[PDB]
Design a protein around this ligand. Structure first.
Ligand code: SRM
Ligand code: SRM
Ligand code: SRM
Ligand code: SRM
Ligand code: SF4
Ligand code: SF4
Ligand code: SF4
Ligand code: SF4
Ligand code: SF4
Ligand code: SF4
Ligand code: SF4
Ligand code: SF4
Ligand SMILES: [S]
Lengths: 417, 363, 363, 417
């Protein structure tokens, strides 16, 4: 073999990525030898060659890339250059283009065939479905081919714009929500699309201290991992009672051990079941979803629907991993979502003003404090924002909460208060 | 004219299946028929079956063409991806499910499965969310695609049937930036370095902005070297996180004999039963050993099975640990506890632990 | 000759009641006869009676005279104090108990109570751990003995009757130095300032050590002037801890009209049923109101009572709250959440929340 | 009247500190009239008046005390001066004397009477019984009566030494333990005295970067608050089976709901009640004590006894209040207690070298890492030390743990090893 270490990963039940690389290699090489307009017949073959060496050396052969992009955007295109340009020229440049997925990754075939036509022609022929944030990854192309790729993207019957990268609003993503799922509390797909459209400018044109991410889940199951992998997690919820169908609950009872698998598992003890009637104390309910998850034919989320906003989530750098925390217990989610947008815009203005170079929203809030955070979004502190009140009495007070005294008087006249 | 910009994505609604478009937000119930096949019944009585398939995430455009030929023939031209990178076709005629499944395995070789059913409490393992590794990235400690292949071969049985008592997510990050939700996953594989960077003063002077390189180090192990217009690193303070190499190419810290993977456990995203939790390192380091990574795979396997073998229905790894405690965890899993596992990352605030990192609260 | 030193306190063993010496380390079972008297059988069946009595902590030497004289009767001339500052007594004759109670009642005037029994499960208020305050302390935001006397006036009936469902300790620190278990008690009173220091610049220039003062501030709020030689303070950064007043004479922050007490809640030191807990601030501020301190004392029962009523047997305050949540609590005790109570104390590290601050683990 | 505000607190059922002060007033002044040897018969009225101003003033009237020592010692005297110095001459110097209490706060009458003798003669007559750390407090005497009082204290038939203050070893304290508790896993009272004697030089003559507090509890009830108050809290425990007697446990069940009050209240579900048998699975027990508290007669702490050491306990300043955390899971408590001492000595060797001026042991451990702390004491890391493994991959590795490589040689080559 030319690639004996990668050949090993053609073995085993699980589909092989090595098979995907190779397949591209052969057929990009066939199309181009048989007359077709293919700019990079050897792209895929260079990358697998380089990937073989990386496996043999146990280290990357990529290096800090240079800035690059399409005319008009300052993000969406990651330059990557190989440190083996000499030996393997075809991978000397091998940039990625991040293409904006449709809401919830829903495709028709004509939409998919367009991208394949466009990528075969201007790039390596390899993709990711999908990038971790949500984007279609065009994986491998030279600087000369970027804009002409984009021009064809824009011109297809069903056209696809470039996603985000850099210190911009990144490509928002959603759970399937109401397209398939009966637990959905809002229209994930609609919101997500509308935020993408509303903030194309914030997305194509990096302006901020660092990157910002929004992800939308239709209920607390949170199937797009929003609280961990977006800065602004929009996780649907309800305020009123869980609707219960008793005929349906009884039919579970003939076979499912509800006592053990439902009643005992509720975090808050709020759901009773006696043999003939199910009783959720909704005042004690936390909307963890378990009881509905277990009993989807019988229990639905309640009628007063909306979303909890979760703030700050990020991977570790600089100050540690975050699972976002309660910023806004409940906000309405209804088109045109002016309520959500006013919180986003206020945050962005604030963060743009106060943020350090390469500081995340979550981190900024850790530095300036939640009161300032709350004043910015014009909302009030709420016990639901904390898992516990403070374990030390070192509280700041406002100058207006302060009682008139000789002291207060003596520090105004000192230039300090 | 002039090149079109700022038109964003094609509107999802133009690309949905007609039965999906009509029953949009009008669903009665779902029902997991069998591994990888979910029946969804609308209030209209329309039944649709969403059929799921494993993918390597890296796809050949020629494969995507194969998937399209297949969607046309079974699913009226429509398909979707999942948030864990599995692929899903829509079938109305239920006497067709098995033909699709068989045509998909045949032609592109992707296994139906990746599903689970809380109702019966029988769960499958789904795809591994992973990133670019040596395929594309310049800051990786490990390879994403090879570890994902070598792990999935071994746990294949668990992607195709519902052999687990609860949900288990396996996720993989090639370095500590994570590029995913690895930090909140029952089983996380996270590449790390164990060697501090050697400053290449000349590359630093040419290409690196110093103050921002310096402020990117979480331990304060970097200081500006004014008279040599470079960066001094204090080794006693460096924990090889890599951040400074993201920031500055003068500061590389790769070591093929010493870069490897952490194994972390007990992360949770959903609210079901118990609060979300970040993962916690339980194995400090395993070598890279391409193309199969046996040591790392051996420990992923040994962790999953100890959990599975002793777990109650619904009880995910962290909810397992919640019941039994860590002492019994390390015993049952047969891992070792060392001083590496005692948290010493100092810059993170106590007060973040007092915050409600979740949607669970009473009204 | 010439003044003997380093001889240490007396040997304890010599100063134990004779029944207590013989049966040292050899006892069968304890028992609580009534409010205040604990019976204790030996192993042989020697019966001793520890009879508890509240003291105002500070005492005249003539109050020490009187007790001794009381002791020389009922307790062979022997006695002890407790960790919460209660005087104890060792009557060997059971028919001689009740008499003793009055003798104390008449002379120095100390009540009988301060006990509690897990057996029946009827707990009651013990004494309040407090300290010198305005009597002898240069850094108090509140007075102890005063704010005590009042609390035990309104909650008197509690000391001398087992009516609480679970153990409750109330305690007080007179400033945030927090002398005593004020950081870990069931209901806590803490003296806090609310005003930044107006530095006496002419007092710093002579008395203080500036680098050790500046660095003593938790938030970097203090920076020096070189000119000048006088510390400056960023008001956008001081949360009025009063630590730099502990360091340096002329960093005063007493505002008579703004210094007051916060109310903490939820602390616990024992292991029983649940792991120890650091108290949590619930009322951000109440004023000094000499001499009866009505706001404070009212809120202490607008807190103790709401718990008292609602709690199960053995369920202390933090154990109550884990059951109901911080939502319910705040509504039930009639309290207000403000942003003041989102912890923002930046310097304490996350990693401490992952240490085992308890003796509770498995072998 | 002279003291309007302070007199209203002379009202009520709880014993008044005012009629403690006023008793000290009129009876010390009686001694002076009667012709008794009393150097400050003035100390207690002046103390009442100053406090009267402070009640009306709502602020203290004591200023920073300047270092006033007793010859030989640096620790033992907290000096305090009064800002109303000329207003009330008798309280110019109202210094406290911390006198080492005998462990367990046990006294014979003689001991107390001779103590009442000296403080009458050389002081104000006001005492604290007892101080928070445990010391008998002599509240307020002049600087010239410090040394004569300590002389008489070392000349009583029953002698009392000075206690601790300043950057030293403070006065170690102990719960009643074996003397009156049947829960005691060791002799708290004896290990208190021993340590108190062994390190007399450490207690009397401050040599550390800050204070250091030890306390001793006989069972996990922590009856002297040692894990919140002491840096090094000895909290008695056991390793084997909790001894159960099914007789008494029967007896209990006649009247005590064991199901709702014990079984179900145990934090790990180790203890069960059958109706006749009580089974404890010691493997899942955590020695929380609740089950021995609920059945004193019928349940005892196990045969194999010792203690758990908790490190770092301390009040707020600087970096936050601490509940001591697991340092040594089990150490045996055996006369002369050499193992306990080896740890402390090792700790102070380490803390005297590496500690900043005014730095509690807990903060330095945080600063230096547990590996170094365990290195010092010679203990391995134990899962029991933590409530969970770390939630980030950011581990330090030691030189000798790495595989030797080209890179490591490069490090050695530049002297970056
Ligand atoms: C298809 C997909 C959404 C999408 O747009 O891509 C999805 C869809 C459903 N999820 Fe999910 N979840 C999907 C990823 C997730 C993930 C997100 C992730 O893994 O990154 C989790 C959060 C991960 C975590 O908690 O760590 C997730 C946590 C849940 C919960 C949690 C179960 C639990 O025990 O905690 C429910 C409940 C359930 O098990 O039925 C749930 C249940 C469901 C239900 C059953 C709801 C319904 O009414 O249909 C949907 C069918 C899933 C099934 O297999 O039975 N879904 N769901 C997701 C694709 C995953 C895959 O291909 O394997
Ligand atoms: C393409 C993508 C990996 C993939 O194969 O899917 C990606 C790849 C890279 N990520 Fe990422 N990240 C990708 C999603 C994520 C996510 C999760 C998400 O978006 O769902 C995160 C965690 C959430 C977050 O951003 O906080 C993520 C967190 C990071 C971190 C920074 C986070 C932090 O700690 O502050 C690094 C470093 C940085 O950005 O400074 C990073 C940076 C990078 C760099 C630029 C490498 C570097 O060290 O400079 C990546 C380049 C790969 C290449 O050249 O081919 N990437 N990265 C992911 C997005 C494709 C898409 O648009 O769909
Ligand atoms: C008197 C005193 C001994 C001493 O001075 O050395 C003491 C004595 C006893 N304690 Fe205690 N405890 C004493 C401090 C404490 C305090 C510590 C403190 O407040 O500084 C508490 C820990 C406080 C905390 O957790 O915040 C304490 C934690 C316990 C535990 C309580 C567990 C719980 O949460 O309910 C048991 C309770 C029980 O026996 O039911 C206990 C039980 C006991 C027993 C019953 C044990 C026995 O068999 O003799 C002793 C009889 C007292 C009683 O009223 O029931 N003792 N005990 C203590 C001094 C305080 C006082 O004068 O009242
Ligand atoms: C004497 C005593 C009050 C009393 O009479 O009851 C006391 C009084 C003072 N303490 Fe304290 N502390 C007393 C026990 C405590 C305790 C509890 C203990 O040790 O058992 C603590 C918390 C536990 C700990 O720190 O380990 C305590 C934590 C403090 C604070 C905070 C220390 C820190 O870590 O930041 C300051 C520290 C300082 O000296 O700067 C302090 C310092 C002081 C000073 C020297 C005031 C100052 O800031 O200069 C006090 C002088 C007495 C006066 O007013 O003239 N005091 N102090 C307490 C000792 C009684 C006794 O010896 O029997
Ligand atoms: S987050 Fe909720 S609505 Fe969305 S796919 Fe998951 S269960 Fe369905
Ligand atoms: S949603 Fe969760 S907390 Fe609420 S009733 Fe269902 S299981 Fe209980
Ligand atoms: S996790 Fe690391 S190596 Fe992997 S793609 Fe992201 S930045 Fe690159
Ligand atoms: S590798 Fe990490 S800890 Fe080390 S110098 Fe760079 S940023 Fe700092
Ligand atoms: S808590 Fe403050 S006021 Fe009270 S004794 Fe300690 S230092 Fe003095
Ligand atoms: S009051 Fe506290 S925070 Fe403010 S300057 Fe003084 S030490 Fe710093
Ligand atoms: S700590 Fe334990 S041994 Fe000591 S007095 Fe309290 S219950 Fe008894
Ligand atoms: S001591 Fe506590 S944890 Fe152990 S068996 Fe008894 S109740 Fe359970
Ligand atoms: S990224």
């Amino acid at each position: 073999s030319e690639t004996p270490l990668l050949d090993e990963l053609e073995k085993g039940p699980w589909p092989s990525f090595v098979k995907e690389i190779k397949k591209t290699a052969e057929l990009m090489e066939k199309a181009a030898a048989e007359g077709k307009d293919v700019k990079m017949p050897k792209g895929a073959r260079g990358l697998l060659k380089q990937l073989e060496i990386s496996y043999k050396d146990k280290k990357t052969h990529w290096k800090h890339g240079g800035i690059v992009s399409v005319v008009g955007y300052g993000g969406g295109v990651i330059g990557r250059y190989s440190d083996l340009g000499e030996q393997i020229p075809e991978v000397e440049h091998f940039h990625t283009m991040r293409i904006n997925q449709p809401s919830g990754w829903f495709y028709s075939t004509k939409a998919l065939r367009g991208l394949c036509d466009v990528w075969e022609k201007w790039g390596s022929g390899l993709t990711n479905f999908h990038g971790s944030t949500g984007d279609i990854i065009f994986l491998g192309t030279r600087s000369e081919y970027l804009q002409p790729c984009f021009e064809d993207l824009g011109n297809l019957e069903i056209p696809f714009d470039i996603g985000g990268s850099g210190s911009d609003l990144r490509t928002p993503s959603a759970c399937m929500g109401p397209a398939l799922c009966e637990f959905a509390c809002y229209d994930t797909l609609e919101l997500c699309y509308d935020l993408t459209m509303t903030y194309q400018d914030e997305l194509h044109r990096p302006m901020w201290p660092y990157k910002f991410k929004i992800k939308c889940a239709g209920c607390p199951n949170d199937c797009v991992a929003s609280k961990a992998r977006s800065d602004f997690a929009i996780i649907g919820t309800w305020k009123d009672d869980i609707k219960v169908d008793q005929e349906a609950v009884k039919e579970y009872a003939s076979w499912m051990d509800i006592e053990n698998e439902v009643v005992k598992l509720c975090p808050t003890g709020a759901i009773k079941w006696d043999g003939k009637e199910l009783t959720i104390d909704n005042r004690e309910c936390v909307r963890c979803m378990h009881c509905i998850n277990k009993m989807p034919k019988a229990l639905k989320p309640g009628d007063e629907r909306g979303a909890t906003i979760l703030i700050g989530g990020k991977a570790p750098f600089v100050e540690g991993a975050v699972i976002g925390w309660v910023a806004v217990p409940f906000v309405e989610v209804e088109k045109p979502y002016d309520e959500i947008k006013e919180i986003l815009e206020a945050i962005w203005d604030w963060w743009d003003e106060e943020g350090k170079f390469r500081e995340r929203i979550g981190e900024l809030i850790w530095r300036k404090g939640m009161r300032e955070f709350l004043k910015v979004i014009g909302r009030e502190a709420d016990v639901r924002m904390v898992k516990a009140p403070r374990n030390n009495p070192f509280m700041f007070f406002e100058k207006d909460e302060l009682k008139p005294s000789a002291y207060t008087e003596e520090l105004k006249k000192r230039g300090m208060w | 004219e002039g090149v079109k910009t700022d038109f964003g994505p094609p509107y999802f609604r133009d690309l949905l299946h007609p039965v999906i478009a009509k029953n949009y937000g009008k669903w009665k119930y779902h029902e997991v028929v069998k591994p990888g096949v979910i029946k969804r019944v609308a209030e209209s009585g329309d039944v649709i079956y969403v059929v799921r398939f494993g993918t390597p995430r890296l796809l050949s455009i020629y494969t995507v063409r194969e998937l399209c030929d297949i969607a046309d023939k079974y699913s009226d031209g429509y398909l979707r991806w999942t948030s864990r990178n599995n692929v899903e076709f829509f079938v109305t005629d239920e006497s067709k499910i098995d033909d699709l499944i068989n045509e998909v395995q045949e032609r592109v070789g992707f296994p139906c499965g990746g599903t689970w059913d809380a109702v019966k409490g029988e769960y499958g393992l789904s795809n591994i969310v992973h990133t670019q590794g040596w395929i594309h990235c310049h800051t990786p400690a490990i390879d994403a695609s090879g570890i994902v292949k070598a792990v999935m071969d071994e746990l294949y049985e668990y992607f195709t049937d519902h052999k687990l008592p609860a949900m288990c997510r396996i996720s993989l990050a090639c370095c500590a930036n994570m590029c995913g939700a690895v930090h909140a996953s029952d089983i996380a594989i996270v590449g790390i370095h164990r060697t501090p960077p050697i400053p290449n003063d000349e590359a630093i002077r040419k290409t690196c902005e110093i103050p921002s390189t310096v402020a990117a180090c979480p331990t304060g192990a970097l200081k500006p070297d004014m008279k040599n217009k470079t960066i001094k690193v204090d080794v006693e303070k460096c924990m090889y996180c890599g951040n400074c190499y993201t920031m500055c190419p003068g500061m590389p810290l790769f070591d093929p004999e010493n870069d490897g993977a952490a194994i972390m456990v007990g992360g949770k995203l959903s609210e079901a039963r118990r609060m979300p939790e970040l993962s916690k390192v339980v194995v400090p380091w395993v070598p890279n050993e391409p193309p199969r990574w046996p040591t790392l795979v051996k420990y992923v396997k040994q962790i999953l099975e100890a959990w599975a073998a002793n777990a109650n229905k619904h009880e995910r790894l962290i909810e397992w640990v919640d019941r039994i405690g860590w002492e019994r965890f390390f015993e049952l899993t047969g891992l070792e506890f060392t001083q590496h596992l005692i948290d010493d990352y100092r810059i993170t605030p106590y007060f973040y632990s007092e915050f409600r990192a979740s949607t669970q609260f009473k009204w």
